[PDB]
Amino acid sequence: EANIETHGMVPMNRLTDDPRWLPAMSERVTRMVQRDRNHPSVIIWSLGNESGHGANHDALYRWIKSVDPSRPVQYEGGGADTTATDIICPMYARVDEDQPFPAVPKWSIKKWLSLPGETRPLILCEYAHAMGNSLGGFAKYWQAFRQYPRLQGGFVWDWVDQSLIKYDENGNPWSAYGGDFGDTPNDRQFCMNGLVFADRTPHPAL
């Protein structure tokens, strides 16, 4: 996945729809493909994450398809089924319940496969957000994956908690999150979404 995320912009594609940022973005895609294209374990390219859908995404998708046709390209931004992706790759689409947001609806995974015109496979780029005591309903996804042939799985969010070690007054280490370093504004415990603790001890959800 290329090092492109512009989630903080308003709207999300304010840079990725702008031709003056097309050189910057193109360097982040083309230099990744040139470095990693010989690795057999790499089977899919990604254009980045949470950057809306802009014209630069469509351009860089067509660049990768020209230079390396041996790997599908995917990209979630702008509703997860745009022309910049070969795979329908939504984040946190539910199995049976639709989430009808305005421009970017998250349809039920089962419903999304049958919308008129849609023919692509569906692989969730993020699902089953494992923040703390979580992964309720995980069996519902896997029942759906096995039953539906075009539901080909997904990628859980995520592997390891992003906590940092701080030390108390007696030098005992403790796991810290968000505003524990004086950083403000911050987003508190939301960095810790892992199936494993930061020392790689498993959570019960694993």
Added chain:
Amino acid sequence: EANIETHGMVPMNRLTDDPRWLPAMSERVTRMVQRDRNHPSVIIWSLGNESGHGANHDALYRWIKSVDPSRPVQYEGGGADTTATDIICPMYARVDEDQPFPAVPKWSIKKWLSLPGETRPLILCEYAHAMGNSLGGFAKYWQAFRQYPRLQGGFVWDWVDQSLIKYDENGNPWSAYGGDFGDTPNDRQFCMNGLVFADRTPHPAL
């Protein structure tokens, strides 16, 4: 719907795959279209019912598409998604549960829409078999019809009970079914599948 049903044959398409019965079958389709093609209420032609899938079905489908392109043609036999139908029109396919028979599987209606290559609308030619105290789970179909755009409804089985009136020794009429006339073999109360009684009084399922 043309007057063609060969459900009792083994296999079901023993006549409809046979060219020596193609003249007979062709008269039952072509004379129906010639009689009824001016009626605006007729919006879909049907090739008959429960006759497997034979080559004669594909021939008569292409005849109707040539002579009258203003109406889609459907036909359920041979698995409800053959080349003889413009609409996926299964009988008694369930909303979420698959029924994997050997040559003619009845997939879940939601799953059937997304199978690879499938692009047609889905309208059940028969569903919610109203035999007696029935129509349990009817709301599940209609939730699915409203949520899925390519699920465009279906036709309930069926309208009126097929019972006949007999009279007792004091002349009191009573509703009769299957073997009540000495007919043997017979299939008993299976003729009565209606939402209404034979005198058009409604059942509670209506």
